[PDB]
Amino acid sequence: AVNSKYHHSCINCGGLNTDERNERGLPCEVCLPEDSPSDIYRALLERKTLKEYRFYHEFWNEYEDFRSFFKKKFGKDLTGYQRLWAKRIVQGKSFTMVAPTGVGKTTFGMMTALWLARKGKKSALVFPTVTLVKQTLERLQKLADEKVKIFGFYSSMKKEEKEKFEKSFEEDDYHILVFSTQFVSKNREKLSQKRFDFVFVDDVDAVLKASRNIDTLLMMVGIPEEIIRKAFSTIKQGKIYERPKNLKPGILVVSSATAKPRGIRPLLFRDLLNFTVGRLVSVARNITHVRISSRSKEKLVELLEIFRDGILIFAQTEEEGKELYEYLKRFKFNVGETWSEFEKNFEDFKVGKINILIGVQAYYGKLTRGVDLPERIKYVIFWGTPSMRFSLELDKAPRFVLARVLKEMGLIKAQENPDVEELRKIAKEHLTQKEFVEKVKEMFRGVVVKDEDLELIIPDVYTYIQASGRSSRILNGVLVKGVSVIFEEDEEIFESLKTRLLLIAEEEIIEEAEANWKELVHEVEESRRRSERELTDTSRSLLIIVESPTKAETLSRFLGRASSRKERNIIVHEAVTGEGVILFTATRGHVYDLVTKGGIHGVEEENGKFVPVYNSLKRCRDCGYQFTEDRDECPVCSSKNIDDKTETLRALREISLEADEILVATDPDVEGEKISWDVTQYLLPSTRSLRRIEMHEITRYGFKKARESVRFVDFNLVKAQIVRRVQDRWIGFELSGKLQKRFGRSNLSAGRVQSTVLGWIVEREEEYKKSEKDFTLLVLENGVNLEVEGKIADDVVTVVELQEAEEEKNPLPPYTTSSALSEISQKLRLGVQEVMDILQDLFEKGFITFHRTDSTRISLEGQNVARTYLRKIGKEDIFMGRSWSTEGAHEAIRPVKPIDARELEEMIEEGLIADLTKKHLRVYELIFNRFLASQSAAVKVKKQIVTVDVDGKRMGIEQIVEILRDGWNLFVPLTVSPRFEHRTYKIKEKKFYKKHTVPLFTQASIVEEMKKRGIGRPSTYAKIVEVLFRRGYVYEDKYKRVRPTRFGVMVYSYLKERYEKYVTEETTRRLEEIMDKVERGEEDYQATLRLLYEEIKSLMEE
Ligand SMILES: [Zn+2]
Ligand SMILES: [Zn+2]
């Protein structure tokens, strides 16, 4: 409802249509001039303009024909997974059945084949075992019509039925063919020549045993052999393959894999049938982790008395597992061991004869491959933390331990490590055995180093997570609860495991006293009882539309990536959640932008109101140029390899049909709200289930609390983005157009704020030059250095006043965008834009809160991030929780996990987390330290105020002399200057120089001045600084000081000469203030466009 135009939005003719009509589902004014038609489909038919709304009307009618067919054959409605699969069947799509076991994947496959048999389409059902072939044929015969022709084949085949199947195979007088997996291998040629409309695979792993079955399956749905080899030639090369546009392949529905999809051949499905064959991911977990500080068998038996059944004890070694087994067998427990008689005691445990099963961490999962038993395992006990250990003896030290020690010492080069035995020679020829251990202790921060036993203990959080997940999974659509108890006595190992679980699984381990056992057991046993009910079905399919690929790639880490569909330009991933299925796809940036030709630089005026016209964005993948106009070739390099957002929008509408509900999860600011509306209004003519999610935190918890505050699109944020965009376009185009006539360069004005900041830099040159005053540095004996005005020839300094007070110095507030850019770029000598890129990187990778923030607010959850870190670090005494601000749409930049940069550094080297460079960790370190200081107690300090006479001038100096109690000292250093006394201090050495009191600008100080003087936004701070560098207006000298170039001075001289009242700071601040009010709904969106046009009208006149 923002009175806009979109150039490819109409759902009927694929052409231009207004924002207002798309929001109401209507096609464009050309297709349907009626504002309120009776039926849109039949209204377009009467006007003889029905073109592509026909596709959606047929899609829904054909889907509901399948739904009626399914409800007539079987007892009841489709499940949430079947609804998604049905809408992909009616579109001819191929996919993996992303769903947990026990949902009815076989039942769907039969109905799909039976439904297509009504239309005359042939299908072929494939099953791993020959028992299932006859079993499926038996169910099919009673579920099929007389006209339906079904023929089977199995190892126990009858003589008369075998020839009937083989004869009808050649005559093509069949509808459904059910045959075994071995059948495909032995009958490779006869199946490849056929073309089936539907292929159902009950078990991929059986089919994927031989690579040649992939070629057979692809040729079974009508993919030519020549295109298969051409696709394999590209995936072997490494890049992705694009299939021919006019290819009509049959449906290939396959089940999820149990084992790993090894090999590069299974990637053929991804490029020809546009779906990924991946194994199911069990990210959906409901576990309460409890830890007991002692490896005591008294509490072990007490826990087993409460649990009573479904316990899976995990010993670390076979020896101590044998010891536990003897103790438990002594207490009349029905306990089974998994080392000698594994099979008998496991199949006893599955039925219910054995209540407690004792396994060994190294080979329980290796033996149990093929049976997960979620209906039996309820409480998982861990006799000791499941950890991998390494010998710290030099002769037995692993390669990764030597890597960090020798790289810190500077002996080994940064590239690939040499032989492990070659690195062992270097360590012996430089380091002693005891020094080798002590270097590990001071560098390896994140693991556990024990000196006496010559052991390096590293908890295996991956193994803990896998063995914990055996107690909680999806049963009958219910994510059942589980309990995981760790009997770890070493606190350092427990703290190491605690932070690794938080990083990977976002789960926490409570202590024995905090756990209420009877409440946990009741939760687990009532959850299993709920699952045992019929429950009917409650699964939905949720689609999350993020804009950044980096965001979607971190969502996949806390959701799973069971499959990946290839949809035009975008990739839509799939995952299994407790609520159903979740899809998530990245938009790859903006979708729409203002055209450059219509009306006033792209904005038209109908009925006196400005209507912005948007055409889809196109990125040239070769030269990077972004353009809006519809072209075949790139306007710069004539390349036809453009990333057209028109296809991205087209894919989103096709996907929107399949999923039940859609949530546009862009960044929680005005920039992300404009993208959210552009997507939302485009999908509204195809789907009414669209809402907005605000993820300030790309995590499980940030995703959860974003959905708790679900809402619709805020048009005030949308209008605010349009006002800023139109101002930059109009001011930029007009001022650049004037500068084009004087200098000849194409793009010379990016807007009003950049010209304001440029004038600051140009006019700072004479401010700094005039401000040169003579100074003299005085070095005092037993005193600090003292800088004072020039020509000091007194040779002595006399103390006149001496005050000693005790302050409690409070810490600095947490980083906002301006604070982060100003301090991090000053400390780590980097441009503000580069710092901004690292900030955006960390936010999208789920390490810090939303970086675009103008508020120091810290949430109660965020305060607990510092408290848990201080409790781990042992300094919980110095925790002073501070909210810092009650106002703010976003809270301050802060680490979302209680993990410091050196701990993150260890995890990256170990391999737990990836994609963080050295500069990522340095920026995160500064963010972590200021945030921890902001939540740390005030440093009780003894201060001194001294009045000192220097050459007859009374100079004041204020200095800290003693720290009475440590606070945020540990995170941000606080220096203590030498104390003064009421004496005469002789001047040791005088240094005469000339220092300018008005300093030159730097990238950090420019950001500081923009915040101070009210111009700029967190979204635009670093961009404004960088554009000046990009267009050659400023440069950085030897000392990293921003100075204006000769070209930049001439350009601003022209601005101050002719158009000063538009560039002046006071007008820029006022308009930035106005646009903030438009975001809050305090100023009128159309009125401020009149305001901008009135100024622009006079800009052309001058
Ligand atoms: Zn139309
Ligand atoms: Zn190009």
Residue numbers in the entry: 2 to 1103
Quote the paper.
It contains the catalytic tyrosine residue that acts as a nucleophile for DNA cleavage. For the convenience of biochemical studies, this residue is often mutated to phenylalanine, which renders reverse gyrase inactive but still able to bind its substrates. The corresponding cleavage-deficient variant of reverse gyrase has also been used, but no information on the structural changes associated with this mutation is available. In parallel to the structure-determination efforts of T. maritima reverse gyrase with a minimal latch, we also determined the crystal structure of the rgyr_Y851F variant. The Tyr/Phe residue at position 851 stacks on Pro660 and is further encased by the side chains of Asp668, Phe844, His852 and Arg853. In all structures the guanidinium group of Arg853 remains fixed through a charged hydrogen bond to Asp670, but the aliphatic part of Arg853 can adopt slightly different rotamers. The α-helix is present in both wild-type structures but is in a slightly different conformation in the Y851F structure. In this study, we provide evidence that the cleavage-deficient Y851F variant of T. maritima reverse gyrase shares many structural characteristics with the wild-type enzyme.
